Amino acid sequence: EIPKEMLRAQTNVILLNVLKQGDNYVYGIIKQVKEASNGEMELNEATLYTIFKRLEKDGIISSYWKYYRLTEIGHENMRLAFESWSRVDKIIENLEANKKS
Amino acid sequence: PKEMLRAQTNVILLNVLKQGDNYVYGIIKQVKEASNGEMELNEATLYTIFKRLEKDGIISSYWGDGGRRKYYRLTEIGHENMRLAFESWSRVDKIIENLEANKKS
Ligand SMILES: COc1cccc2c1C(=O)c1c(O)c3c(c(O)c1C2=O)C[C@@](O)(C(C)=O)C[C@@H]3O[C@H]1C[C@H](N)[C@H](O)[C@H](C)O1
C-alpha cells in the first residue's frame, strides 16, 4: 500500500482540482471523485472536513451558501506548485540522461 | 512551502539512489548539475533525510573502496515503494483528467 502522508497529499491534490473545475459542496465532490475514479476512490466526509478546515485556515478556499470555492490565493499556489513539481521532473530526467552518458 | 521542498528533496534523492548507489558528496554534485545549479543541497539535510529513510528501511549504507567512501543504496522495499508511489500518482493524474472530461459531458 501507499504511505499515508502521501495518500493525504494525493487527496489534497484531487480536492483542489475539483474546486478548480468549479465551486462545489461535499456531496458533489465525493460523488464526482468516485465517478472520475471509476468507483475506486471513495472519500469520507470527515476526511474532507478535516482537509477543508485546513485549506480554509490557510486561505486556499472559502465557503458560502455549504459550497466551497478556490480563492485567488489558492489558484496562485496551484500554479507555483505545478511549476515546482515541473522543475523536479526535469531534475529527475537530467539525472537519468546524465547516468546513461 | 517547506513541506513541499522536503517532499521534493526526498523524491529527488530517492531517484538518485534509484539511478545507482552513491555517496553524499556525489549525490549533492549530481543534483547540483541536474538542477543546473538550482538545487545545492547541504550535507546536513541529507543526513537528516537519510536517518529517517534508513530507519524506515528505505535505504541502507555500506563502505565501498584509493580511499574509502560510505555509499547509500535503495533497498528492495525502497524500490517497491517507488513503484507503488509512481503508480498511485499516475492514477491521480488520470482521475483529474477524467474530472475535466466528465465536467463538460
Ligand atoms: C500536480 O502535481 C503535483 C502537485 C502537488 C503535489 C504533487 C504533485 C505531483 O504531481 C507529484 C508527483 O507527480 C509525484 C510525487 C508527488 O508527491 C507529487 C506531489 O506531491 C511523488 C512521486 O515522485 C513518488 C515516486 O513518490 C511520484 C510523482 O512523480 C511522478 C513524476 C516524476 N517525474 C517521476 O516519474 C515520479 C516517480 O513519478
Residue numbers in the entry:
A (entry chain B): 3 to 67, 77 to 112
B (entry chain A): 5 to 69, 73 to 112
From the reporting publication:
LmrR is a transcriptional repressor regulating the expression of the multidrug ABC transporter LmrCD. In the apo state, LmrR shows high affinity for the promotor region of LmrRCD. This affinity is reduced upon binding of a drug at its drug-binding site, enabling expression of the multidrug transporter. LmrR is a homodimeric protein with the drug binding site at the dimer interface.19 Central in this binding site are two Trp residues, W96 and W96′ (residue 96 from the other monomer), oriented face-to-face at 7 Å from each other.
To investigate the importance of π–π interactions for drug binding, the electron density in the π electron cloud of W96 was modulated by progressive fluorination of the W96 indole side chain. To assess whether the Trp analogs influence the overall structure of LmrR and its drug-binding pocket, crystal structures were determined of LmrR with bound Dau for LmrR variants 5FW, 5,6diFW, and 5,6,7triFW. The crystal structures belong to the same crystal form (space group C2 with very similar unit cell dimensions) and were refined to resolutions varying between 2.55 and 2.15 Å. Although the crystal structures show generally good geometry, they all suffer from high crystallographic B-factors (average B-factors for protein atoms varying between ∼57 and ∼89 Å2), indicative of static disorder in the crystals. Nevertheless, the electron density maps were of sufficient quality to identify the Trp analogs at positions 67 and 96 in both polypeptide chains of the dimeric LmrR variants. No major differences were observed in the backbone and side chain conformations around residues W67 and W96, compared to wild-type LmrR.19 Moreover, as shown in Figures 2 and S6, the binding mode of Dau to LmrR is not substantially affected by the presence of the fluorinated Trp analogs. Dau is bound in the same way as in the wild-type protein, with the aromatic part of Dau sandwiched between two Trp analog residues, stabilized by π–π stacking interactions. Thus, we conclude that the different Dau binding affinities observed for the LmrR variants are not related to conformational changes of the protein or significantly altered ligand binding modes. The binding affinities of LmrR for Dau and RBF decreased upon increasing degrees of fluorination of W96. Dau behaved less extreme, with the kd decreasing 6-fold.
